[PDB]
Design a protein around this nucleic acid. Sequence first.
RNA 1: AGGACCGAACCGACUAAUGUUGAAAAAUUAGCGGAUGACUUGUGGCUGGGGGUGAAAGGCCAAUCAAACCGGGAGAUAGCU
RNA 2: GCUCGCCGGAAGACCAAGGGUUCCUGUCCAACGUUAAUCGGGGCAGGGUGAGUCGACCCCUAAGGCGAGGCCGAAAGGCGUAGUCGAUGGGAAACAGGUUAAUAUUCCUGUACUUGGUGUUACUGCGAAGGGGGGACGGAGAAGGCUAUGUUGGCCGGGCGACGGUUGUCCCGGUUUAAGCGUGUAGGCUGGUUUUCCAGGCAAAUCCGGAAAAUCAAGGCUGAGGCGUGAUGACGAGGCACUACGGUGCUGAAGCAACAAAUGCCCUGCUUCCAGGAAAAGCCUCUAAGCAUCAGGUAACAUCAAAUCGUACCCCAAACCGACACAGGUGGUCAGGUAGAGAAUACCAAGGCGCUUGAGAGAACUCGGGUGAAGGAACUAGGCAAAAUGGUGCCGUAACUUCGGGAGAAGGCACGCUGAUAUGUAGGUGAGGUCCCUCGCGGAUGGAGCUGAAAUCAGUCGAAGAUACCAGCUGGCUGCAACUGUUUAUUAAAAACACAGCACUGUGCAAACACGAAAGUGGACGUAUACGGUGUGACGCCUGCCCGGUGCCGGAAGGUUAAU
RNA 3: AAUUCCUUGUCGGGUAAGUUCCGACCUGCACGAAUGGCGUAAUGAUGGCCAGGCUGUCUCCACCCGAGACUCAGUGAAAU
Lengths: 271, 46
Amino acid sequence: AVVKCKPTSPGRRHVVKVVNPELHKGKPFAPLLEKNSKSGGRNNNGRITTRHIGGGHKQAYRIVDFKRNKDGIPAVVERLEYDPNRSANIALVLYKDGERRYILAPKGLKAGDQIQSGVDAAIKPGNTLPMRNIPVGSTVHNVEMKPGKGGQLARSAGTYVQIVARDGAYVTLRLRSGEMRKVEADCRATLGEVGNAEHMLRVLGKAGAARWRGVRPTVRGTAMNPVDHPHGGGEGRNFGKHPVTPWGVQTKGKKTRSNKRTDKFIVRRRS
Amino acid sequence: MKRTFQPSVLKRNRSHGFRARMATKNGRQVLARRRAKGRARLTVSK
RNA sequence: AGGACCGAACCGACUAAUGUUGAAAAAUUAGCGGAUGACUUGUGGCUGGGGGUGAAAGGCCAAUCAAACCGGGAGAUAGCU
RNA sequence: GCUCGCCGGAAGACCAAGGGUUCCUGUCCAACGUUAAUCGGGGCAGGGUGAGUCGACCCCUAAGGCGAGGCCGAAAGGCGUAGUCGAUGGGAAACAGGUUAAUAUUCCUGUACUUGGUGUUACUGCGAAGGGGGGACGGAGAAGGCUAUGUUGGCCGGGCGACGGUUGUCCCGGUUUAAGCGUGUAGGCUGGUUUUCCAGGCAAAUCCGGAAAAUCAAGGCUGAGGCGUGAUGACGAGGCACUACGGUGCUGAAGCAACAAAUGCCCUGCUUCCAGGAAAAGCCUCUAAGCAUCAGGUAACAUCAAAUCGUACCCCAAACCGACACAGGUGGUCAGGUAGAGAAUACCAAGGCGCUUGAGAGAACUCGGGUGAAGGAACUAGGCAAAAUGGUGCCGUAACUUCGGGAGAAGGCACGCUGAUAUGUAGGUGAGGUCCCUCGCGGAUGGAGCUGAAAUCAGUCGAAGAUACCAGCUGGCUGCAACUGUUUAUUAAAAACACAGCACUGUGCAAACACGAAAGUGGACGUAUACGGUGUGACGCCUGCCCGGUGCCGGAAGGUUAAU
RNA sequence: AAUUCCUUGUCGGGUAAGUUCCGACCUGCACGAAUGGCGUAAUGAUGGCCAGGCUGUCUCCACCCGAGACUCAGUGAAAU
């Protein structure tokens, strides 16, 4: 759900956050935790690499699995908790001999069901099998499109992948980005959707609410000193020339894809 | 009032100290130029 | 509960006055104010010259800066003094 | 020597950085302290710095630096995986008595304990650079059980009085007590006990992570305070011994619980919350390796040993720094009584100082504070500045509004003392008995008792009772700016800037993009509910046309056309 | 009007008078929808205009207190 704050003091009325009464809490599982450290855009080799970054309150990384290697063993969901690294939230899983793993949340917000993987697996969430099994026209979840990179796509809150068509050794997938791609039917999929799906509804309401996440204020190129951005300070409200990067180059509408190695797998292109 | 240099033999020995200078090409050259001018001290922290 | 009302410690610049060859390389006296925050702070680090840092004044970068400081080319050049 | 004064959250006490012979007695007075100087942090000597346990070291290591093998680079230099430094973090070891001219958790006394060996006594599987639990981390709120702290009474010792009162109508001061070691209570967490089992924890596992059968729920872990023990030792007002009323010792009264509790404990707690909040080793525990009346592991002890660094002194300052013994700058710990909400604020407490030019005088004028008649904002660019208001229980309140606010609107009452309200209400705390048991630092039910606001009304008193310090000016029109914020050290502070949200554009991820002459890292261990580029500016209602030029995309058939 | 000469436009309101204030108007020499448009409260180290209390800002100061102006001794400058 989403909930809105009362006007107790100025501006606070705008604040809207995601709340879930079934969402659990506790301590992270230490063998799948690392402190990960802040990067701050300040550079090991010289001058800064990134912009609009500074400060932010302490965070750690919970290590999530997209390899799903323990085949033919039933595992149980133990708890679903708030995650600081991805908006989908992350669940804790216990395997039948004692191993514990963190997984991308299946839909249902619930724990206690048992899941398997193979060439054939139950129709339920969290169970994984190859897309060659299914008659298409459905949701496939996170998909192992390239074995050497694990389960790809649809990792953020409420994200989804539609399987559109099939023939022989291949199938086609359509994405909420505007791109459509072709893959081998033998590629592993977990089926269904990602949970949460409310993260885009959040309204910060306050000018400090991104500051505690390390987000630095944005100063305009046409307002800062003429040597410190290619646009340069006014000359009030008169931008002058065509928009460019801080590095002096035109960008608007100019396509920058140069990959050339995966375009044969893209059957309909993002506009 | 407050000074731009406050007294500290720890941070003086870290920047201008003998081994600290010697451990850098340019600081070892400052010491070589101390010997060229004939300066009686090579450290002013010890 | 709180980028909340007043308010010690803590912080601090806005008005007024004194100071201005001073106690003074920026303080003093009185008041208004900042005080759970987009805050403040003890301790040690990291960011450098057209480079840093800046909720961004070409302000700040050890009093210096439309380009710091020292040492060199350099006793450069001056139809002038 | 007597007396006075000021500071007393400092003008005091302790710790540290940084400095460096500053400490003390013994003298000296040329120079120094912009003086007098007999003083002195000055001159010049002599004496002084006693540690197993205190701060450092130990052992682990954050940010960061260095960096092999390896890589980038003519090279100075640098990247990055081990490794090694490094805490501001995590990890073994002493208290409070009185002594010296000057020292001290460093001496001497009393008492305590950790580390290591050896001996004593009972029980015993100990153990990786590996496995598990811990170490271990946010913000805030609220229950329980307390303690420094302080007064009354008890108790002790002293006094009873220069004018009147003061032997029950009191005055004065005490009543001290640690480290530790038990007892293991409150608070916190957590089910015991035997049996067996294992496609996880890189091999093994008796530990965790899980399962299965039976018996039974108070067994176990953690931890304030008290109480006992340490402690009839130390301390003690007050006596007394002797040469020396010269100092230097001896002795020694009472030594309690009733209530309020600090910024301190139990607390790395419990509870709640979104920003979901270091690692490792010591420690405990599992097994591998290895090993045997050993060694190692546990409870209680006797006895021997305990490297090294540091140590003199000052400090919101004459010992630091500001060229100075300079109205300045400056880290950590502490804050009693009376009054008071109080850390505001005063008299004060313990404690400290009375100055590194002095004497005097006193006019126009210079600086601040004090007094203010009648008038009052006329002054001035401006109520700037200054004065008045000022406390909080009970009353009473407009427009506008995002319904929260505006608002302490506006406008009013009351305040000492005593009596009468409640001879003291609210708030907090509370004996025995009833009670439930398991015995017991019982548990739990309750309301005799204790402590104790803020308030009211009458009557009398003053100029005045929120008596001092402390302590809100009120109302209306209006441009512009959402609000909290940001804005340049000593003339330029807001309408400029940022922000919640709005749009366009690049990006399918080994992204696009950036820095790096790179090795590499950042983008991000983020994946389209996610990132790069540029403008807009919360919130409510909202968005006309133009593609010639200059950019960009779709098409590549045609034209133009280069090196070749 | 943060955009406007002559302009204090032109009219109304406040006022003994009012280039200021408040409100309208169009004939903007030249506002205009993201180089955004328009409006609303608490609010503003915001600016303009009025009312009341209170008051040495002022009529106009007059007298005090603590420290300098004076003087003597000690130690005794600088700019020029």
